[PDB]
JSON list of C-alpha atoms in Angstrom, two decimals:
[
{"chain": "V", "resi": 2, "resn": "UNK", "atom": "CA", "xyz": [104.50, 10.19, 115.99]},
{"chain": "V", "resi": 3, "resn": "UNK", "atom": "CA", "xyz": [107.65, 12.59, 116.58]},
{"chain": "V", "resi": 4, "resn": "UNK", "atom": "CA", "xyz": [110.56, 10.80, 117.21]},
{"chain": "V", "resi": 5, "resn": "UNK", "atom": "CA", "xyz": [114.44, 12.70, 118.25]},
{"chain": "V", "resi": 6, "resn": "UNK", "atom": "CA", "xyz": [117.47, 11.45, 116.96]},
{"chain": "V", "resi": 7, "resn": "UNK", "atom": "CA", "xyz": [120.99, 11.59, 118.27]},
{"chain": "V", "resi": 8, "resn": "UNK", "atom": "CA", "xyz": [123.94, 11.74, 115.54]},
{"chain": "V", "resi": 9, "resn": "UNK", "atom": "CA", "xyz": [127.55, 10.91, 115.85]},
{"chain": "V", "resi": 10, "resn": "UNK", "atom": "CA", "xyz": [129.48, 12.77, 113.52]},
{"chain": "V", "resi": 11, "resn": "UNK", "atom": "CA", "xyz": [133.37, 12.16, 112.99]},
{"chain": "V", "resi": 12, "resn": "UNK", "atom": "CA", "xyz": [134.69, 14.97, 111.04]},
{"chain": "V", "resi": 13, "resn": "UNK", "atom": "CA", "xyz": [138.05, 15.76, 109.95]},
{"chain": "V", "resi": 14, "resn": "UNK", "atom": "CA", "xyz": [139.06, 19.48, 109.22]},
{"chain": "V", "resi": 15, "resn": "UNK", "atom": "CA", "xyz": [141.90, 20.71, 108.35]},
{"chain": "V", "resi": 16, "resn": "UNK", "atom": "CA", "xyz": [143.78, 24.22, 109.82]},
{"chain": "V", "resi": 17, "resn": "UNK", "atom": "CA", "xyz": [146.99, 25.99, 108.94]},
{"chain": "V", "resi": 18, "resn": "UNK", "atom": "CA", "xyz": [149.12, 28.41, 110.61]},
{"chain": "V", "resi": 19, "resn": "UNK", "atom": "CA", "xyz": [152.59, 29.80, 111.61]},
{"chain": "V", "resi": 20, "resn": "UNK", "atom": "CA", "xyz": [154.42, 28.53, 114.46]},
{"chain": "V", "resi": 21, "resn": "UNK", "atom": "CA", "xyz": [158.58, 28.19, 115.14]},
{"chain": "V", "resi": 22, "resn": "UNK", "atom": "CA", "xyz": [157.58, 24.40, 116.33]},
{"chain": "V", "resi": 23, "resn": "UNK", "atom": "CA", "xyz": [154.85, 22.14, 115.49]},
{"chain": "V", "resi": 24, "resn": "UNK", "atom": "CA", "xyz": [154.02, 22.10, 119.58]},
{"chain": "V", "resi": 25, "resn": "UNK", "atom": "CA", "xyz": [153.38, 25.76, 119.64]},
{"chain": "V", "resi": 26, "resn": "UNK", "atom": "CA", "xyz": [151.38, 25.07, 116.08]},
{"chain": "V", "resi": 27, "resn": "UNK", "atom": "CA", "xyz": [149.24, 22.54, 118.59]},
{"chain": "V", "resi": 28, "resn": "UNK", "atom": "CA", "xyz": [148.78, 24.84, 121.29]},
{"chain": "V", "resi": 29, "resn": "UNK", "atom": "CA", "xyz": [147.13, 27.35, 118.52]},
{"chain": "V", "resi": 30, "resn": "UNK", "atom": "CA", "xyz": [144.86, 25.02, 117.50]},
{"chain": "V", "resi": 31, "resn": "UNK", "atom": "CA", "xyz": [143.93, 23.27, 120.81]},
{"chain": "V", "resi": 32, "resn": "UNK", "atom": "CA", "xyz": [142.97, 27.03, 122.02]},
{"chain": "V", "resi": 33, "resn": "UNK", "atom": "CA", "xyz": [140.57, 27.40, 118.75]},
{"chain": "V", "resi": 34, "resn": "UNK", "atom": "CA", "xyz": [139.32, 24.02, 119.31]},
{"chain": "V", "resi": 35, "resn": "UNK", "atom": "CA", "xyz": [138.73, 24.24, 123.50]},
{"chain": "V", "resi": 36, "resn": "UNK", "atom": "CA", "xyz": [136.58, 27.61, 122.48]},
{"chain": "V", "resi": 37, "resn": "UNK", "atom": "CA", "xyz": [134.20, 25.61, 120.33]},
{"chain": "V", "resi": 38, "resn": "UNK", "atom": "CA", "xyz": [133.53, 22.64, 122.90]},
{"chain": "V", "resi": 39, "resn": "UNK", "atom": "CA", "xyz": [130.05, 24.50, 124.26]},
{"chain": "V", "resi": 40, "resn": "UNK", "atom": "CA", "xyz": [128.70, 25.84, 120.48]},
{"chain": "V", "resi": 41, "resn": "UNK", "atom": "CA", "xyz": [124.99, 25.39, 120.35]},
{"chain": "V", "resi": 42, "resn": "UNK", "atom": "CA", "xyz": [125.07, 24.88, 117.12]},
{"chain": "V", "resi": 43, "resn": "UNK", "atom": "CA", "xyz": [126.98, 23.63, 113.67]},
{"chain": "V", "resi": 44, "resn": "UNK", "atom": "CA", "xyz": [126.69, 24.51, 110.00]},
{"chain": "V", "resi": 45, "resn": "UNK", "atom": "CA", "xyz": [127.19, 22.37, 107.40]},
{"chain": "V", "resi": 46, "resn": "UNK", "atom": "CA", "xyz": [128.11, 24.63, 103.56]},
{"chain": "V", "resi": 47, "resn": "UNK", "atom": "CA", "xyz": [126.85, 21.20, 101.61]},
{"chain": "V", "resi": 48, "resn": "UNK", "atom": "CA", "xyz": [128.48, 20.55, 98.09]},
{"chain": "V", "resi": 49, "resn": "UNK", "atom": "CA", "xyz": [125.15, 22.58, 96.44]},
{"chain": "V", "resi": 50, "resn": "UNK", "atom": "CA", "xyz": [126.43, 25.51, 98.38]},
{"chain": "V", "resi": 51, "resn": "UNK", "atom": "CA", "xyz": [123.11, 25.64, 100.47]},
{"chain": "V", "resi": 52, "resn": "UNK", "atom": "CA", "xyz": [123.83, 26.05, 104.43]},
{"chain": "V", "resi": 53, "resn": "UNK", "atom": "CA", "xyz": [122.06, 23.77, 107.03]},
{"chain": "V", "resi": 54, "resn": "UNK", "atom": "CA", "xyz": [122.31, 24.46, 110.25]},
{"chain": "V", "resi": 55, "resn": "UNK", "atom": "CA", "xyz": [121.85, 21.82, 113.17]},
{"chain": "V", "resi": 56, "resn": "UNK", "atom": "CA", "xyz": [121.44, 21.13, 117.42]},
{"chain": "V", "resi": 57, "resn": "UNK", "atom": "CA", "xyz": [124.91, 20.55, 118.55]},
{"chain": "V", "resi": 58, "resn": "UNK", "atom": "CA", "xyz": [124.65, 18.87, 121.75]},
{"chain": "V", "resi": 59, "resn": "UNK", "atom": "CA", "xyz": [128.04, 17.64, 122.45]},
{"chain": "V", "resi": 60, "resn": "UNK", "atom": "CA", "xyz": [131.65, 17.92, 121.24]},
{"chain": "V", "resi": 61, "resn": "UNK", "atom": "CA", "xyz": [135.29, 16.93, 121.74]},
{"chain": "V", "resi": 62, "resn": "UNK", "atom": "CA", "xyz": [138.04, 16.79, 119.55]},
{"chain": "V", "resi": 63, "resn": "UNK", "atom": "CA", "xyz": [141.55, 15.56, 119.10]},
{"chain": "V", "resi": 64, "resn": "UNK", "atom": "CA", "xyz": [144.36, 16.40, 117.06]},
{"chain": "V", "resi": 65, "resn": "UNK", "atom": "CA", "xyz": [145.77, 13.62, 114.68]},
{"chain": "V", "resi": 66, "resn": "UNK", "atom": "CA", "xyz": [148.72, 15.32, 112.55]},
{"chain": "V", "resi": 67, "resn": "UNK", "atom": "CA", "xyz": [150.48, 18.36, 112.64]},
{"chain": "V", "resi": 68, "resn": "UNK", "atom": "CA", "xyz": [152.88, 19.20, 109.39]},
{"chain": "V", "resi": 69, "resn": "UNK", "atom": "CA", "xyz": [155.18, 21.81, 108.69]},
{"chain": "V", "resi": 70, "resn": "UNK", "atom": "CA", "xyz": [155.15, 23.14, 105.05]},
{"chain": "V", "resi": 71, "resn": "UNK", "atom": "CA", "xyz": [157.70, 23.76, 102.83]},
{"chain": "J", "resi": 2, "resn": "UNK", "atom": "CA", "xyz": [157.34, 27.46, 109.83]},
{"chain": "J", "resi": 3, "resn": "UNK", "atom": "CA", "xyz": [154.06, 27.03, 108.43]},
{"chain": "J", "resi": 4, "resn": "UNK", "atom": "CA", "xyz": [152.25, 23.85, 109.49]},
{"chain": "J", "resi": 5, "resn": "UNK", "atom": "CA", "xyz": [149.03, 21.88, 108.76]},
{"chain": "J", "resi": 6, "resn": "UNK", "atom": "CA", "xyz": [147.09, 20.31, 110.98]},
{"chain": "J", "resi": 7, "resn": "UNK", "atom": "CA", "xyz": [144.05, 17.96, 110.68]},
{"chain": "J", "resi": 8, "resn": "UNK", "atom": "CA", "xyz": [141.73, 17.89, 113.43]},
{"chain": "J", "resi": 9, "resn": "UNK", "atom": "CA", "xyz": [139.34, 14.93, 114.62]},
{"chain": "J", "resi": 10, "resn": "UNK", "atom": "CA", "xyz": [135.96, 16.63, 115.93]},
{"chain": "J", "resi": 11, "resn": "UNK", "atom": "CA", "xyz": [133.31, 14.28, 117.10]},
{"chain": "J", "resi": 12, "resn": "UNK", "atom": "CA", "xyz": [130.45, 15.92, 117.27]},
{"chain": "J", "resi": 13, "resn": "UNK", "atom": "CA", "xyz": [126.86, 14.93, 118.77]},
{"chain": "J", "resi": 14, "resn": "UNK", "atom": "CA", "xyz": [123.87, 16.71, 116.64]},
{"chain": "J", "resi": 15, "resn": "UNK", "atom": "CA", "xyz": [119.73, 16.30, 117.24]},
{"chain": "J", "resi": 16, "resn": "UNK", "atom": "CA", "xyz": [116.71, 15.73, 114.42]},
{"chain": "J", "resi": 17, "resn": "UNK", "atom": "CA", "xyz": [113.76, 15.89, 114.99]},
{"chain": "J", "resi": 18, "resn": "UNK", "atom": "CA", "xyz": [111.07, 14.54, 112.62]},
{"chain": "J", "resi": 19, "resn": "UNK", "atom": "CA", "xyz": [107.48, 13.07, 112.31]},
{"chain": "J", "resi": 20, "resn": "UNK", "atom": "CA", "xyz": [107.09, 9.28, 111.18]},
{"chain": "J", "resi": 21, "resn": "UNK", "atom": "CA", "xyz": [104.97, 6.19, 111.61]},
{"chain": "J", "resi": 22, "resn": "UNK", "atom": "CA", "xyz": [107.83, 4.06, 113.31]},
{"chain": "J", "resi": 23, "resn": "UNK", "atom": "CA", "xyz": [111.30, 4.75, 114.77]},
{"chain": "J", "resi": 24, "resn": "UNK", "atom": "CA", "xyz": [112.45, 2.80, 111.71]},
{"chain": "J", "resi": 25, "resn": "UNK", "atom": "CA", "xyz": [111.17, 5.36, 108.99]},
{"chain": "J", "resi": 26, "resn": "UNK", "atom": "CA", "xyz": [112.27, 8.25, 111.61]},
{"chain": "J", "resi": 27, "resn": "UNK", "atom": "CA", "xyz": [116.04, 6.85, 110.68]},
{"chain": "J", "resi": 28, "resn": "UNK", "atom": "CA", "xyz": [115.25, 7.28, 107.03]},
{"chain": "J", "resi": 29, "resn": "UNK", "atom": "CA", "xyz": [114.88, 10.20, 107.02]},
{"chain": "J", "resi": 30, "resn": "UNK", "atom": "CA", "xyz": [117.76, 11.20, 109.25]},
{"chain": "J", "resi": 31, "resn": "UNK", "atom": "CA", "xyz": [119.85, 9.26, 107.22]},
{"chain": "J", "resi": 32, "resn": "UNK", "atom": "CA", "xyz": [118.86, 11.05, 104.11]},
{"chain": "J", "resi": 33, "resn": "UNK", "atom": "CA", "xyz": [119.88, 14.94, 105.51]},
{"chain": "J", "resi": 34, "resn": "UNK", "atom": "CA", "xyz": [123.46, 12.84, 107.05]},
{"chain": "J", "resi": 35, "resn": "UNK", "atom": "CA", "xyz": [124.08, 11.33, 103.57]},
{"chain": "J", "resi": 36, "resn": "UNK", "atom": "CA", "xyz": [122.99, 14.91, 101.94]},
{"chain": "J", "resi": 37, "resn": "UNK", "atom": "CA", "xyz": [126.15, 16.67, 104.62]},
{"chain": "J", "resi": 38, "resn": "UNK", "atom": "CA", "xyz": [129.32, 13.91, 103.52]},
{"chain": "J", "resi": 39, "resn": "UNK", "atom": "CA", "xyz": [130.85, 16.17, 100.58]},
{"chain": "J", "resi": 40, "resn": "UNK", "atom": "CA", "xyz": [130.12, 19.21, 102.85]},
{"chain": "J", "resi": 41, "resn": "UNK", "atom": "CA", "xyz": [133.42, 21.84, 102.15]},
{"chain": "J", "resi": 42, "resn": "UNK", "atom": "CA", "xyz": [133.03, 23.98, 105.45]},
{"chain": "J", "resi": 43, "resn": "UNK", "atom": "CA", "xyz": [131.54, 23.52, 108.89]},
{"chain": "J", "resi": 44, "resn": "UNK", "atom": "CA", "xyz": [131.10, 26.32, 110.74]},
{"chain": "J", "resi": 45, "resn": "UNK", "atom": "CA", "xyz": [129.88, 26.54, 114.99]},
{"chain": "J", "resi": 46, "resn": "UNK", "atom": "CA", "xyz": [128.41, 29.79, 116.70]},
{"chain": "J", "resi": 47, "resn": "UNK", "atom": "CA", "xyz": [130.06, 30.59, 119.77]},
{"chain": "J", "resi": 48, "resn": "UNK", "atom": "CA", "xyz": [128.19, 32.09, 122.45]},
{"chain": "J", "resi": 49, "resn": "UNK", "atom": "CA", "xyz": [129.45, 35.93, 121.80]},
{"chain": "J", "resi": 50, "resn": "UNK", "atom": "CA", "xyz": [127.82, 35.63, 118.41]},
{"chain": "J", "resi": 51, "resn": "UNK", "atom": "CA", "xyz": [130.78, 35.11, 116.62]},
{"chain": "J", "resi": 52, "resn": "UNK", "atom": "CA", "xyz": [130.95, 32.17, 113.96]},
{"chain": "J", "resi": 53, "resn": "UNK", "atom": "CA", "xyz": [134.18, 29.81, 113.47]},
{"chain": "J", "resi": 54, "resn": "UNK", "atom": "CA", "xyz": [134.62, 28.49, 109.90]},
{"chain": "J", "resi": 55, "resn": "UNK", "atom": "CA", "xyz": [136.74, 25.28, 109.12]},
{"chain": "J", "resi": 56, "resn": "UNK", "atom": "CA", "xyz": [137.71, 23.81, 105.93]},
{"chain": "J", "resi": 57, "resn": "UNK", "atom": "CA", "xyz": [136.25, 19.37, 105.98]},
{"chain": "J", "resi": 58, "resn": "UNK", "atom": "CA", "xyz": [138.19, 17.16, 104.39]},
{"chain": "J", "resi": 59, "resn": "UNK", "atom": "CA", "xyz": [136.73, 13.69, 105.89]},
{"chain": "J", "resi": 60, "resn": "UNK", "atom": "CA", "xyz": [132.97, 12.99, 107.48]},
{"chain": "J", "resi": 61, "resn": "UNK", "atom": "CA", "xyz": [131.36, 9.93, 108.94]},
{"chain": "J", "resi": 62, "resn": "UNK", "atom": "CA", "xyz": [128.01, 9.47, 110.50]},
{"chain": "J", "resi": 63, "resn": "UNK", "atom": "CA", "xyz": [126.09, 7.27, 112.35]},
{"chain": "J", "resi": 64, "resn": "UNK", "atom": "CA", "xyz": [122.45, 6.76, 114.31]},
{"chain": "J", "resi": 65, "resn": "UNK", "atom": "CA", "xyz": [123.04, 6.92, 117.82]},
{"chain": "J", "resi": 66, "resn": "UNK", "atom": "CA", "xyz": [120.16, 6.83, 119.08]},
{"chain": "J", "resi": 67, "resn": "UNK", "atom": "CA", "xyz": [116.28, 7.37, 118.34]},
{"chain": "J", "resi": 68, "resn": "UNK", "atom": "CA", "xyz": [113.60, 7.68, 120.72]},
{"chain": "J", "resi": 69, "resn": "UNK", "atom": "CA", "xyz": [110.05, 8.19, 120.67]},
{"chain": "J", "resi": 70, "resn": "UNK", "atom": "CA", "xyz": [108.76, 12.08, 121.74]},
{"chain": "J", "resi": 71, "resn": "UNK", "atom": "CA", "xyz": [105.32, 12.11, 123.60]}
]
């Protein structure tokens, strides 16, 4: 029989860029992140370097730490 | 005033596959998910064609669902 499948994924990525505050550092990222919530689809570059692409049906996204660097 | 952030993304994917039961359908999904958790990059497609790369430190998976197709 076919059967579909629904995954929940929880990834964690990591982004870097300049800012003079780690707010205005957010509000860079946020306005990457709100332009991907309607992407039809993801790619994944596995650890053998081969490229699978997937369905993306849904996303949202939060951010959990923001770091200035030395 | 460089800064890193790190950036939860929950994502919702679909597979579809043939089986004899919902049971080995979920093998089989589970098999590509565990094949994606040492993944470097994930990448979406935005709707102007363009493609948004992102370096992964962290995934997690799970089965949300599985249903039956007719």
């Amino acid at each position: 029989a076919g059967y579909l499948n629904n995954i929940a994924l929880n990834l964690e990525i990591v982004l870097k860029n300049k800012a003079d505050s780690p707010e205005v550092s957010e509000t860079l990222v946020t306005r990457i992140c709100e332009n991907l919530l309607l992407s039809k689809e993801v790619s994944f570059l596995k650890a053998d370097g081969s490229v699978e692409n997937f369905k993306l049906s849904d996303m949202e996204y939060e951010i959990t730490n923001t770091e200035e660097l030395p």
